Amino acid sequence: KKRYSRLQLLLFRR
Amino acid sequence: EVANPEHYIKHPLQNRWALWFFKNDKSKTWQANLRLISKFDTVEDFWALYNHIQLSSNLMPGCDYSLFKDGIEPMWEDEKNKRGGRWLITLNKQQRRSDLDRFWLETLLCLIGESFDDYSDDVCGAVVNVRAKGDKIAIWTTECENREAVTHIGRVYKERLGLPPKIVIGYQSHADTATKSGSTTKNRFVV
C-alpha cells in the first residue's frame, strides 16, 4: 500500500 | 543493470482518482451539469491537474468540485455511496477568504495520500460546494454504520484541517440528509 504524508505530497510538487 | 527507478518514475497513488465539475446552469439537468474533468493516479499527475485549475474560492456560485475514487460517481445514488454519509465542514461567508482553498487542498491531500490508516478503503471521495449561502466541504464514506471507521476518519480529518477541540464537526448519512425535515440534518457522529 501507498501512503504519503502531507509533507511528501508537497515536496513532490517541486 | 537497469536504471534506478527513484531517478525517473512518477510516484504512484494507491488509487486512481477522478476530478469532477458541477456547473450551475438552471436551464440544464443535474446530469448534464455534472462532468468529469480528468483522472490521475500519481502524485505528479495530481499536481499537473491542481496547478492548472481555478481555486474553489474563484468558482461561480452554485458550482462544485468533487474528487472520487475511479468508478464512484459523486452522487449519493452510486452503489458505493447509497449506504454512506459525509463528514461536513460548513464555512461562513468570511471563511471563503481565510479557509476554503486551504481546507479543500488539505482534503485532496488526505484523500490521495491515504491518510486514514486502516480505514482508507471506507473513503469514497470529497466534494466542495461553492455557495452564496455558505460553502461546504465534505468527505464521503461508504457505510454510515461502520462506527469505528467513520469516527476514525472524522478525527483524522479534523486534525488534518487543524480545527481546535472547541470546534465540533458532524457526520450525516446521505439517507438522513435526503429525508430531512427542515434546514438541519441530525448527526450520526460528531468529533
Author numbering:
A (entry chain B): 2 to 15
B (entry chain A): 27 to 217
What does the paper say about this structure?
The eukaryotic translation initiation factor 4E (eIF4E) protein is a vital component of the cap-dependent mechanism for mRNA translation. It binds the 7-methylguanosine (m7G) cap structure present at the 5′ end of mRNA molecules and recruits it as part of the eIF4F assembly which also includes two other partner proteins, eIF4A and eIF4G, to the translational machinery for protein synthesis. We have used a structure-guided approach to rationally develop a set of hydrocarbon stapled-peptides with high binding affinities and residence times against the oncogenic eukaryotic translation initiation factor 4E (eIF4E) protein. Crystal structures of these peptides in complex with eIF4E show that they form specific interactions with a region on the protein-binding interface of eIF4E which is distinct from the other well-established canonical interactions.
Two 15mer peptide derivatives of sTIP-05 (sTIP-09: 1KKRYSR*QLL*FRRR15 and sTIP-10: 1KKRYSREQLL*FQR*15) were synthesized, one with an “13RRR15” sequence extension and the other with an i, i + 4 hydrocarbon staple shifted to positions 11 and 15 of the peptide sequence which encapsulates the “12FQR14” sequence at the C-terminus. Significantly though, their rates of dissociation decreased relative to sTIP-05 and hence residence times were improved (68 seconds for sTIP-09 and 39 seconds for sTIP-10). The guanidinium group of R13 was involved in cation–pi interactions with residues W73, Y76 and hydrogen-bond interaction with the side-chain of N77. For R14, only the backbone atoms were visible while no clear density was seen for R15. We computationally generated a complete model of the sTIP-09 peptide using the crystal structure as a template and subjected the complex to MD simulations. The simulated trajectory showed that R13 was relatively stable, remained in contact with the protein residues (albeit via an unstable R13–N77 hydrogen-bond, occupancy < 10%) and hence, contributed favorably (–2.2 kcal mol–1) to binding along with the other core residues (Y4, R6, L9, L10 and F12; –1.7 to –7.3 kcal mol–1) in the peptide. They were highly dynamic, corroborating the lack of density in the crystal structure, similar to that seen for the “ButPhI” functional group in &13.
